[PDB]
Design a protein around this ligand. Structure first.
Ligand SMILES: Nc1ncnc2c1ncn2[C@@H]1O[C@H](CSCC[C@H](N)C(=O)O)[C@@H](O)[C@H]1O
Ligand SMILES: Nc1ncnc2c1ncn2[C@@H]1O[C@H](CSCC[C@H](N)C(=O)O)[C@@H](O)[C@H]1O
Lengths: 283, 188, 283, 187
DNA sequence: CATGTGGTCTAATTAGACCGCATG
DNA sequence: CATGTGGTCTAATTAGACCGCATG
């Protein structure tokens, strides 16, 4: 009947995809990831017990690699948004610098895409920021031949995260509803003795200034009467990752907030991956 | 191969530079043709696959990086990526095979990393056509193409591009269009 | 007829004593800790659900404080050894620097000792290093009126940790044995895909060079071909602490290693605290 | 208080310094007694509680820190800590109520930190006794004691201890004096 | 007007190199 | 002879202040 799912993960980072597929019961046969930061590779290799195959730089994978490693049923991707987000002033755009890496994703997608005679199921998803210039968005849409759906994590987590998602998954525009296990408020993610001055927080970048909310940059936590910033475990709880999911490779708060700031929201990707349980085998 | 009386007039799609004034010199286009077997578009940012399919079937797709200095609100990589997109839009169905060709030429506008992304997205290494006059090279192009169409080092080309910042070398590439005479009809 | 235990922990640090008592199933009515390092207090407060009372510096604790907070059934102590250990070339001895803090223990101990009419059981324990000058050990024994038992943690863990223990706990001289859960080799504490070059590890301190074993300063773990230092979770496994027990307060690697290098060995203190189940109420 | 014919000679234990030739000069010990009912040990490093208990029951224990010309083999705090450790041995059982006294005197060799440690371990603030000659302080001492026995600011004492770095038993004998109402007065 | 999957620069901040010698 | 609940010094390493403007 139903068969396990074969995934090709692009700019995988901390392997949020595999984690969602696992938490969903979907049985995974292959999970080929392309990642270059050794810390993220360590996260993925430890927290999933070496079930993920890593393929290194995206610009060194050929069509022969896609055919041999293939066939693939799912292709996830989220390219670097360093030259695309409008928070960086020196941003170079989609056709210069990090943005160009998007065209690698594209290049592989049409490689792994089934031919016009093969009616096999094949799914794909690409994610990037909303805070990009409209030209970058329209060009990404043109190359993907799809218009995006904008999802903010504030409906399912305790933080804002407006992100654009292109793809063909079932019901990508279906209404987003919250689950009973989702921590909607900041207090639901905090630790003992800590109090949330806020109920929802802003978007969390890889930088420290994002952890201080408001135009006046206020601290979010109060502990023993003092103003304190968020802890790493609470960031993991906000994003939806399991607790101590990023506690590897002797990483301090810098590398951990960096890896989490480039990542996805676990409940959002759970929502977007949920319909796949009807096409593929479930554990 | 196709016989002479069954050869059809070729239908081409020029993507950045207009080769009509040059292809008409090789007898692939009639000087007067309101049907216009060549489709030329210069700002392809708003083009959808349905536009390419509605414009009609194409036997050849041509693109070129703007000649040295003649740039405008676009990097060199933009032309390569857009050419790849539109070529994928125009390539015929594999289950309905037909003579199909494409070409992309650079006038030393792409640097090394752009050269690598070009060779990766076009799946071949370029050929370097030189213009040697008086034993000295004056201009040169790089061509990626699937048509079965003098040696000099990369250092000479780099110094040539360095000096020639202070122009279209269509004559060099024209020969590369000659092998297309056997598949499509030859005007007088 | 057994009653919950009432504890007084001087220099509590990572609150190891509470962890050991609650792992042995002993009901604790009152646990008063005297710690100054805010990060240690954070570990103890978060990981034990605020069931611990902190009373700041031991030098500001008066006999009236002992009578108010008391009576006490257990006294626990481990004073700073930076001036007692021989690894420090600028050690100041037992009567200068941090060594004087020992005499605070002594003081509070005499304040918490029951009257001779009180047949109520009263237990106490003091821990310090083996690598101290013989005069300092002599004087500690003189002031405590008993000789110490020497215990090395290699019998129950994967690292060397030679420590002197003064006290009157039942059977402190009985032979030490390793339970099934005692991770004896270094390979048992390592993460996925990381292999141990050594079977046992040298004594781990707050300083980083303690991780580099041997006179050649050889790394103890290899991964993907290259040598690497021990991770914080692996250190927590070595000392017997639960995983991510010290993952609080946005602490980097150095702070965690400091905290763990000052603390005790969990299985050693479990061995020492096991007899108290026969006198006090178990859960 | 106790009647005079029932007053007994006081058994005293002098630590670090010797109060003989001073208390005997006051009338608490006879000069001829070879045992002298006084115990004196200068190096208390290897003294056990059983040693103190065997050395006889004591009515008074005394300790003093060596003056600016100290033995300087031990820190000034060693004397205080060892005095505490031994006094805790020499005290009588609660069920044996008896007149028991103690005294520790510092000759300005302790630092303010060690002063606080001393006041913490001895459970009281000291009393500074001054030697005033020609309206000018010459020497001074600090005393902690439980015996029911001229003002100077700590800056005079600070500059004094700073200059005099280049034994005021007389100042302390007055503090011993109130012990007459409990023990025998020798002629 | 508030905001933002960021880069730069520089002041703290941290970590590795160095040193250290009393005891089984 | 090897080792060690370390301290110091200096070279990296990191983190906070600063800046930035296109889109709802
Ligand atoms: N050339 C390249 N090849 C492969 N991965 C690359 C790359 N350049 C950057 N990356 C990786 O691409 C990632 C983009 S950040 C996106 C992470 C992912 N969306 C998540 O949820 O974790 C980064 O982790 C970066 O290390
Ligand atoms: N004056 C003081 N009062 C109380 N605690 C103090 C102190 N000076 C130092 N300390 C604390 O005493 C601890 C000694 S290290 C021993 C830690 C503890 N035995 C454990 O197993 O975790 C240190 O954590 C230090 O922060």
């Amino acid at each position: 009947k139903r068969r396990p799912i074969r995934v090709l993960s692009l700019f995988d980072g901390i392997a949020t995809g595999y984690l969602v597929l696992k938490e969903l019961g979907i049985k995974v046969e292959k999970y080929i990831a392309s990642e270059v930061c050794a810390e993220s590779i360590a996260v993925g290799t430890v927290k999933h017990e070496g079930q993920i195959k890593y393929v290194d730089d995206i610009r060194n994978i050929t069509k022969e690699h896609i055919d041999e490693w293939g066939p693939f049923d799912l292709v996830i991707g989220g390219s670097p948004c360093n030259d695309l987000s409008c928070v960086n002033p020196v941003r170079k755009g989609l056709f210069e610098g990090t943005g160009r890496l998007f065209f690698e994703f594209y290049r592989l997608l049409n490689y792994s895409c089934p031919e016009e005679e093969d009616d096999r199921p094949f799914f794909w998803m690409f994610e990037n920021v909303v805070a990009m210039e409209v030209g970058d968005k329209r060009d990404i849409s043109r190359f993907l031949e799809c218009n995006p759906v904008m999802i903010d994590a504030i409906k399912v987590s305790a933080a804002h995260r407006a992100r654009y998602f292109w793809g063909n998954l079932p019901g990508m525009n279906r209404p987003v509803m919250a689950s009973k296990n989702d921590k909607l408020e900041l207090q639901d993610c905090l630790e003992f003795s800590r109090t949330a001055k806020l109920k929802k927080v802003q978007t969390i970048t890889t930088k420290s200034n994002s952890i201080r909310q408001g135009k006046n940059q206020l601290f979010p936590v109060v502990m023993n009467g003092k103003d304190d910033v968020l802890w790493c475990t609470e960031l993991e709880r906000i994003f939806g990752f399991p607790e101590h999911y990023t506690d590897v490779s002797n990483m301090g708060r810098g590398a951990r907030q960096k890896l989490l700031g480039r990542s996805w929201s676990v409940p959002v990707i759970r929502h977007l991956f949920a319909p796949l349980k009807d096409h593929f085998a479930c554990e | 191969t196709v016989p002479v009386w069954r050869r059809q007039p070729v239908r081409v799609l020029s993507l950045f530079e207009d080769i009509k004034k040059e292809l008409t010199s090789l007898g692939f286009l009639e000087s007067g043709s309101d049907p216009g077997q060549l489709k030329h578009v210069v700002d392809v940012t708003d083009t959808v696959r349905k536009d390419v399919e509605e414009w009609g079937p194409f036997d050849l797709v041509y693109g070129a990086t703007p000649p040295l200095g003649h740039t405008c609100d676009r990097p060199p990589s933009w032309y390569l990526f857009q050419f790849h997109r539109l070529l994928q839009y125009a390539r015929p169905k594999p289950g309905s095979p037909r003579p199909f060709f494409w070409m992309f030429v650079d006038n030393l506008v792409l640097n090394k990393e752009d050269l690598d992304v070009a060779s990766r997205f076009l799946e071949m290494e370029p050929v370097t056509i030189p213009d040697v006059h008086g034993g000295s090279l004056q201009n040169a192009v790089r061509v990626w193409s699937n048509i079965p169409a003098a040696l000099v080092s990369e250092e000479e080309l780099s110094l040539l591009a360095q000096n020639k910042q202070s122009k279209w070398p269509t004559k060099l590439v024209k020969n590369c269009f000659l092998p297309l005479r056997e598949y499509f009809k030859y005007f007088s």
